[PDB]
Design an enzyme around this catalytic site. Sequence first.
Site, PDB file in Angstrom:
ATOM      1  N   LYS A  50      12.252  -3.330  12.506  1.00 13.72           N
ATOM      2  CA  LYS A  50      11.476  -4.301  11.749  1.00 13.72           C
ATOM      3  C   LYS A  50      12.393  -5.470  11.423  1.00 13.72           C
ATOM      4  O   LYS A  50      13.470  -5.279  10.858  1.00 13.72           O
ATOM      5  CB  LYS A  50      10.939  -3.666  10.462  1.00 13.72           C
ATOM      6  N   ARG A 153      -4.649   2.701   8.362  1.00 16.02           N
ATOM      7  CA  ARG A 153      -3.814   1.680   9.004  1.00 16.02           C
ATOM      8  C   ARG A 153      -2.328   1.852   8.638  1.00 16.02           C
ATOM      9  O   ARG A 153      -1.451   1.408   9.383  1.00 16.02           O
ATOM     10  CB  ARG A 153      -4.300   0.268   8.631  1.00 16.02           C
ATOM     11  N   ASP A 170       3.822   2.762   6.137  1.00 11.32           N
ATOM     12  CA  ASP A 170       3.685   1.358   5.749  1.00 11.32           C
ATOM     13  C   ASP A 170       3.201   1.231   4.312  1.00 11.32           C
ATOM     14  O   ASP A 170       2.527   2.120   3.799  1.00 11.32           O
ATOM     15  CB  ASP A 170       2.721   0.616   6.684  1.00 11.32           C
TER      16      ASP A 170
HETATM   17  C1  LIG Z   1       2.638   3.046  20.252  1.00  9.79           C
HETATM   18  O1  LIG Z   1       2.854   1.707  19.821  1.00  9.79           O
HETATM   19  C2  LIG Z   1       2.960   1.597  18.464  1.00  9.79           C
HETATM   20  C3  LIG Z   1       4.018   2.216  17.801  1.00  9.79           C
HETATM   21  C4  LIG Z   1       4.160   2.121  16.420  1.00  9.79           C
HETATM   22  N1  LIG Z   1       5.207   2.775  15.876  1.00  9.79           N
HETATM   23  C5  LIG Z   1       5.925   2.442  14.797  1.00  9.79           C
HETATM   24  N2  LIG Z   1       6.947   3.240  14.417  1.00  9.79           N
HETATM   25  C6  LIG Z   1       7.686   2.969  13.349  1.00  9.79           C
HETATM   26  C7  LIG Z   1       7.420   1.829  12.602  1.00  9.79           C
HETATM   27  C8  LIG Z   1       6.371   1.008  13.012  1.00  9.79           C
HETATM   28  N3  LIG Z   1       6.040  -0.139  12.295  1.00  9.79           N
HETATM   29  C9  LIG Z   1       4.825  -0.940  12.586  1.00  9.79           C
HETATM   30  C10 LIG Z   1       3.900  -0.812  11.355  1.00  9.79           C
HETATM   31  C11 LIG Z   1       4.650  -1.041  10.023  1.00  9.79           C
HETATM   32  C12 LIG Z   1       5.977  -0.261   9.918  1.00  9.79           C
HETATM   33  C13 LIG Z   1       6.758  -0.659   8.681  1.00  9.79           C
HETATM   34  O2  LIG Z   1       7.153  -1.817   8.540  1.00  9.79           O
HETATM   35  N4  LIG Z   1       6.980   0.337   7.819  1.00  9.79           N
HETATM   36  C14 LIG Z   1       7.736   0.140   6.571  1.00  9.79           C
HETATM   37  C15 LIG Z   1       7.560   1.379   5.708  1.00  9.79           C
HETATM   38  C16 LIG Z   1       6.850   1.281   4.511  1.00  9.79           C
HETATM   39  C17 LIG Z   1       6.676   2.417   3.718  1.00  9.79           C
HETATM   40  C18 LIG Z   1       7.210   3.634   4.127  1.00  9.79           C
HETATM   41  C19 LIG Z   1       7.020   4.875   3.257  1.00  9.79           C
HETATM   42  C20 LIG Z   1       7.919   3.721   5.321  1.00  9.79           C
HETATM   43  C21 LIG Z   1       8.097   2.592   6.118  1.00  9.79           C
HETATM   44  C22 LIG Z   1       6.851  -0.555  11.140  1.00  9.79           C
HETATM   45  N5  LIG Z   1       5.646   1.342  14.088  1.00  9.79           N
HETATM   46  C23 LIG Z   1       3.214   1.389  15.691  1.00  9.79           C
HETATM   47  C24 LIG Z   1       2.146   0.744  16.345  1.00  9.79           C
HETATM   48  O3  LIG Z   1       1.196   0.011  15.666  1.00  9.79           O
HETATM   49  C25 LIG Z   1       1.562  -0.467  14.361  1.00  9.79           C
HETATM   50  C26 LIG Z   1       2.028   0.849  17.739  1.00  9.79           C
HETATM   51  O4  LIG Z   1       0.988   0.235  18.384  1.00  9.79           O
HETATM   52  C27 LIG Z   1       1.350  -1.008  19.026  1.00  9.79           C
END
Ligand SMILES: COc1cc(Nc2nccc(N3CCC[C@H](C(=O)NCc4ccc(C)cc4)C3)n2)cc(OC)c1OC
Length: 288
Positions: A50, A153, A170
């Site tokens: 990120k 989501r 998220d």
């Molecule tokens: C398979 O492709 C994808 C993988 C993922 N895999 C993935 N794995 C880890 C993180 C991540 N993201 C995207 C969505 C938001 C996430 C983020 O910023 N999390 C912060 C966070 C907030 C609270 C907590 C408790 C943990 C982490 C970062 N995404 C996500 C997808 O859609 C959002 C995908 O579709 C395109």
Amino acid sequence: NPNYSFAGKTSSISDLKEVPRKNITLIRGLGHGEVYEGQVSPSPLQVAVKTLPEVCSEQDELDFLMEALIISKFNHQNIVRCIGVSLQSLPRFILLELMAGGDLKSFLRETRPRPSQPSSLAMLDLLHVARDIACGCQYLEENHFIHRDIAARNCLLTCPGPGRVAKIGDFGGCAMLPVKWMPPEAFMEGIFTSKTDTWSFGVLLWEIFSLGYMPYPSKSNQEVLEFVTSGGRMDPPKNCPGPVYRIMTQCWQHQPEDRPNFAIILERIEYCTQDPDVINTALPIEYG
Ligand SMILES: COc1cc(Nc2nccc(N3CCC[C@H](C(=O)NCc4ccc(C)cc4)C3)n2)cc(OC)c1OC
């Protein structure tokens, strides 16, 4: 440098695990603050990266750092891990447990039973996701942390195939507020307890058992607000077992005190999981 307090322990920017920038390689985009698939280096560690935009506000910088502090201190199997950070190079990175199954909402929508693949999902798959998130929520509740946006989501899946694990991955003039996931009292006294998360979990359950539909489908935010405040509740999703719908309606009790905690939610998910009439209910085939 602001400090963050979790489970009575205080941590700051300097306690975060800095990963040398040269060890990190970006592989492909995932979504968008943009997210990438990455690896950290024979047997590298694949991660999600990120990023913080280089041209951003001061508040953006602060929000990004605070997020990293919060996530890094979570320690639970149903909450996506923070591997480390790379804040000493630009753009700044937060490194997360890679969730190869993507978000739960997209998954449910894409994996709906259809003529092409009629056995893509079963009730037990849905109850396992539900249980997984309930387990993350119970951890947050036990540690006196309120999420505020327990929604499909914001749930991520380890892998697309079977053996998938759902995790909370998220965070969430009020057009951005997740109204359809908020209890009546959120708009009244604006105060939050874990009974807030209980309410939102009921909406997540509806999302899960409807296979990724938007809650209160024909209603706008304000309509939902007035509906819910006056005692209005969603109908069961199509083919929803009664026992599962009763979990939702208990989560949506107007009085917070009358709502179950996550220990009770898990017990009721487990009783559902042990009921053959529940788990043998066929999910609706969407016409394709
Ligand atoms: C398979 O492709 C994808 C993988 C993922 N895999 C993935 N794995 C880890 C993180 C991540 N993201 C995207 C969505 C938001 C996430 C983020 O910023 N999390 C912060 C966070 C907030 C609270 C907590 C408790 C943990 C982490 C970062 N995404 C996500 C997808 O859609 C959002 C995908 O579709 C395109």
